[PDB]
Amino acid sequence: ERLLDELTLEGVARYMQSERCRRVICLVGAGISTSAGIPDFRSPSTGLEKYHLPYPEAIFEISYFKKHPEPFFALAKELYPGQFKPTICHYFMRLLKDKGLLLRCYTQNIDTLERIAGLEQEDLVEAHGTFYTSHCVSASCRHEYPLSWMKEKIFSEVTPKCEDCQSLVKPDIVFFGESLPARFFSCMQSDFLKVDLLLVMGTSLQVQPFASLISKAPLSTPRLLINKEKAGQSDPFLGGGMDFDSKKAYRDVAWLGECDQGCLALAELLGWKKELEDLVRREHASIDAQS
Numbered sequence: 001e002r003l004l005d006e007l008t009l010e011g012v013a014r015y016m017q018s019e020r021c022r023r024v025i026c027l028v029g030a031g032i033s034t035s036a037g038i039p040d041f042r043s044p045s046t047g048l049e050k051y052h053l054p055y056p057e058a059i060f061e062i063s064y065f066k067k068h069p070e071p072f073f074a075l076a077k078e079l080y081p082g083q084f085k086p087t088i089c090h091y092f093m094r095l096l097k098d099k100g101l102l103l104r105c106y107t108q109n110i111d112t113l114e115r116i117a118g119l120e121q122e123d124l125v126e127a128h129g130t131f132y133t134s135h136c137v138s139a140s141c142r143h144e145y146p147l148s149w150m151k152e153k154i155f156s157e158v159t160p161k162c163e164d165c166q167s168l169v170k171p172d173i174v175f176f177g178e179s180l181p182a183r184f185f186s187c188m189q190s191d192f193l194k195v196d197l198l199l200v201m202g203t204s205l206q207v208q209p210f211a212s213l214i215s216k217a218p219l220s221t222p223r224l225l226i227n228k229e230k231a232g233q234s235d236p237f238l239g240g241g242m243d244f245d246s247k248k249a250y251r252d253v254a255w256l257g258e259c260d261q262g263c264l265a266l267a268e269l270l271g272w273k274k275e276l277e278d279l280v281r282r283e284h285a286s287i288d289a290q291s
């Protein structure tokens with residue numbers, strides 16, 4: 001009685017173009033931005049003593065930031081991407097939006113590429129925050145600053161201070177010690193009542209609470225993983241995990257390869273390849289031509 005006629009990319013595409021599939025939730029992580037040249041700082045090959053930290057994790061912790069922000073901002077300058085060109089995966093989500101299929105994109109990423117690709121605030125749950133905006137850290141002020149302002153401060157090596165009250169200004173990313181945005185929990189509680197398809201791309205589903213999102217889907221909702229490695233199955237030691245391969249599997253599909261190549265394959269099955277090619281090449285040309 002399952003919704004997918006077969007547990008393959010072709011089965012998912014046929015489901016997507018049936019009347020049963022109207023609302024797609026994307027869950028995306030660092031794997032959708034590595035081909036944009038933005039490394040996954042959790043991947044060890046792209047994972048410091050120049051900052052003389054009391055302990056290595058302090059540069060990611062909020063109390064240390066508020067007392068000693070200079071290491072964080074020097075690291076931010078070191079890591080600042082040289083260009084912001086969203087990937088095929090990002091623009092595939094923009095096509096989902098254009099076609100009225102995108103209920104929400106939950107992202108682990110802080111690089112703003114979802115917004116550059118044309119997803120709007122309403123479409124996005126930035127579960128780990130974002131560099132897109134920054135705020136004065138004083139509770140009585142909370143003046144908001146755009147990324148252009150923060151970038152100027154970062155590259156000029158001037159510690160960003162609020163123009164109204166001279167408190168620190170912090171990018172809206174979730175440091176260790178900060179809670180996830182309330183938007184994450186509010187949206188989760190509403191969106192997963194409404195979803196027809198979960199598209200999980202470029203995440204190992206290891207960081208919490210983001211990973212537990214897959215268990216919030218209704219029992220019937222197909223879940224497609226596009227990722228370099230299989231992810232989201234129950235841990236045989238610590239264990240609604242993914243079931244891709246057992247005789248009881250009925251709704252979870254793993255497409256193992258590069259995220260851009262999987263999204264391209266899905267778009268091609270859907271008849272969207274020309275639309276996606278045209279969109280990516282136009283937007284990339286526009287970004288490359290920024291003057």
Ligand SMILES: Cc1cc(C)nc(SCC(=O)Nc2ncc(Cc3cccc(OCc4c[nH]nn4)c3)s2)n1
Pocket residue numbers: 038039041059060061075076077079080081110111112128129131132173174175176
């Ligand atoms: C600079 C820049 C600008 C723009 C537009 N984009 C980029 S993207 C490339 C990248 O890595 N940059 C980084 N700068 C700082 C980082 C450390 C850090 C601290 C605290 C929470 C962090 O992340 C939230 C979180 C919590 N738990 N999981 N994630 C990260 S990393 N970089």
Ligand SMILES: [Zn+2]
Pocket residue numbers: 136137138141142143162163164165166167
């Ligand atoms: Zn202020």
